[PDB]
Design a protein around this ligand. Structure first.
Ligand SMILES: O=c1[nH]cnc2c(CCNCC3CCCCC3)c3[nH]c(NCCN4CCOCC4)nc3cc12
Ligand SMILES: O=c1[nH]cnc2c(CCNCC3CCCCC3)c3[nH]c(NCCN4CCOCC4)nc3cc12
Ligand SMILES: [Zn+2]
Ligand SMILES: [Zn+2]
Lengths: 357, 357
């Protein structure tokens, strides 16, 4: 395979379906990337994460630079070897979780140059530029100041990435659009990033308190500003209906802790909406978590059993809820891909929402 | 298969190797039975427990009668269905964990009759008589009083088991020898149990503070008192060297929480002795937990990785340590069985101890 190639196989409106090819594997888009720790996903072995349909995972840079340390992980052969995951890994820059700020970077020092080096040491396949997620709400002036700094950091990230031969030849680099909810700043930010040039473009600065209507409003004008021929990554999103609406607006990639964190807390996703498995109504329910789901958990155990495990604080309850919720998210993405491929994504979006809500 | 048949295929001294056949499967002896919760083993799926070589698991009656309740579990199809484990399950009587005592039973009411009924409701394949584990040390008088009561409870257990057709036809019942460390009381207890008649005989009242020398001393005279043609179960044992010495003294079956509990706490068993994986010396150690172990954990992850996971409190660290330690225990039992089968168990016991210590 090549270092990076994004191919769009089918379109419906602003929605797209395709593949990213990289050296470590192929990523089907639109893609959901499960997030981890030193685990590929909390409470799951890498083979389980793969079995659920994940093509790529999100490496938690902040966690890992803290302990065991990026240099240690490099010494040990890199994050793929350490974890036992041989497919692509997208690493975050560590920016969001760390947020004294200066033009140099953040002290808490994490600069664009250090961030790109740490992602190199982990052995990232998709490297994120180091940015600042502007808080919401933001005044036009603060949004502009913050976006401008982020674009300067994006150039510093590009050059740090490019100055490292092994990294430039084997990994990809994504830039991140800022500008809060303001159309003109989003345009300035898209223009700045495309001038620098990246392999993919994220939409940053959303899912930070503005709510779905506003987030969709901002995506409506913001995604068409990015290059069409590159992947579009919406950071930190989200709930199943957020994902469907974002794909309707041209998003190709997603990450969120919701399926994993929700799962350990007792929330299971189903095609009829989420359920809280601790509720007494499930104590003798012999049905699987979801009636249609293809995952190993829904083939083998009942709601009643998982209800007991979560109420009892058992680790196996966390394992089983997490495997089902990450499988549900991959089945959602497969249904989105197939529906766009078949020209029926609009109907799928409406059928999904009618049942889910 | 039959309801219960124990066959001895080979002997060396007092050590024996063979099989117990039951309706749900065959149990290779000497056997280690992993202990659970509502999980077959904490942090493991039933297929993982099987993959480690377990033929039978120990069902935690006390935990399960408390929540979700034995009647609920019966309503849901029994513990095998609930858990997803279709092989034999030995249930404890709930006695030990509950320990106002009376001749009727314990109030905390758990009587011999209730205990046998709860084990029926869970759907146990090997049912334990309800007894009292005499505290150590005990005066001759208290040991005798307690043993006498236990033998009366053993008769009550036999008759409760026998009065229930489905249970008498499909499950087995084991009696438990008491008598503390006193030879004459151990003999009285063996005689009483053999008069009643059971499918197997446990040695109770040990591993309760007396230490290995005393426990071995008591096993030396106590196991030959039990019927030779039935299995001998040493309850609550133990460390790998305890297991080897007990097999040298005629024990066929074991249960203990040590591999599972130890594992979650960071202790890994190896042929060179246990290690504490949290120790700094393992932070960059790329070797597997044990150099010879055949388990999936030792095939795929390093000491260094598991060190990080346990230090970080990750659930995956508990999962991986537990799978390795239960696999180590099954490999120990396989080495014991093969060595007795080949007439070289004495040499195995000595080689094992020289390396382990
Ligand atoms: O504007 C943003 N820039 C960069 N990151 C953002 C994030 C982080 C997305 N996922 C990070 C994940 C890494 C591994 C450990 C868990 C966290 C955002 N997240 C959200 N909403 C939630 N909005 C974001 C914006 C940015
Ligand atoms: O004399 C004894 N009678 C009955 N039980 C004993 C036990 C319990 C053995 N395992 C129970 C296991 C059930 C599931 C949950 C975890 C506990 C003994 N354990 C020990 N040493 C430890 N000595 C025992 C004696 C008896
Ligand atoms: Zn499922
Ligand atoms: Zn192992």
């Amino acid at each position: 395979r090549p270092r990076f190639s994004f191919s769009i196989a089918a379109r419906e409106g602003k929605a797209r379906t395709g593949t990213i090819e990289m050296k470590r594997g192929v990523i089907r888009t639109p893609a959901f990337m499960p997030v981890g720790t030193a685990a590929t996903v909390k409470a799951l072995k890498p083979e389980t994460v793969r079995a659920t349909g994940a093509d790529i995972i999100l490496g938690n840079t902040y966690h890992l630079m803290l302990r065991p340390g990026a240099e240690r992980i490099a010494k040990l052969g890199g994050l793929h070897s350490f974890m036992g995951w041989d497919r692509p890994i997208l690493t975050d820059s560590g920016g969001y979780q760390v947020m004294k700020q200066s033009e140099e970077g953040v002290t808490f020092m994490l600069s664009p140059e250090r961030s790109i080096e740490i992602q190199h040491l982990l052995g990232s396949d998709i490297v994120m530029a180091f940015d600042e997620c502007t808080p919401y709400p933001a005044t036009p002036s603060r949004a502009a100041s913050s976006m401008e700094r982020s674009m300067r950091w994006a150039k510093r990230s590009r050059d740090a990435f490019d100055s490292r031969k092994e990294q430039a030849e084997n990994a990809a680099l994504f830039g991140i659009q800022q500008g809060s909810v303001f159309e003109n700043l989003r345009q300035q930010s898209a223009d700045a990033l495309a001038e620098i040039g990246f392999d993919g473009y994220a939409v940053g600065g959303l899912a930070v308190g503005e709510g779905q209507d506003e987030m969709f409003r901002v995506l409506d004008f913001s995604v068409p500003m990015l290059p069409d021929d590159k992947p579009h990554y919406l950071m930190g999103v989200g709930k199943p209906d957020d994902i469907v609406g974002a794909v309707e607006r041209g998003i190709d990639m997603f990450d969120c802790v919701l399926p994993t964190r929700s799962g350990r807390n007792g929330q299971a996703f189903t095609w009829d909406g989420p359920i809280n498995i601790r509720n007494a109504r499930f104590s003798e329910d012999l049905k699987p978590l979801d009636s249609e789901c293809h995952c190993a958990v829904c083939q083998k155990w009942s709601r009643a059993y998982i209800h007991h495990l979560i109420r009892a604080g058992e680790i196996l309850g966390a394992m089983l809820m997490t495997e089902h919720n990450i499988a549900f998210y991959q089945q959602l993405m497969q249904k989105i891909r197939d529906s766009i491929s078949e020209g029926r994504f609009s109907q799928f979006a409406q059928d999904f929402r009618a049942r889910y809500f």
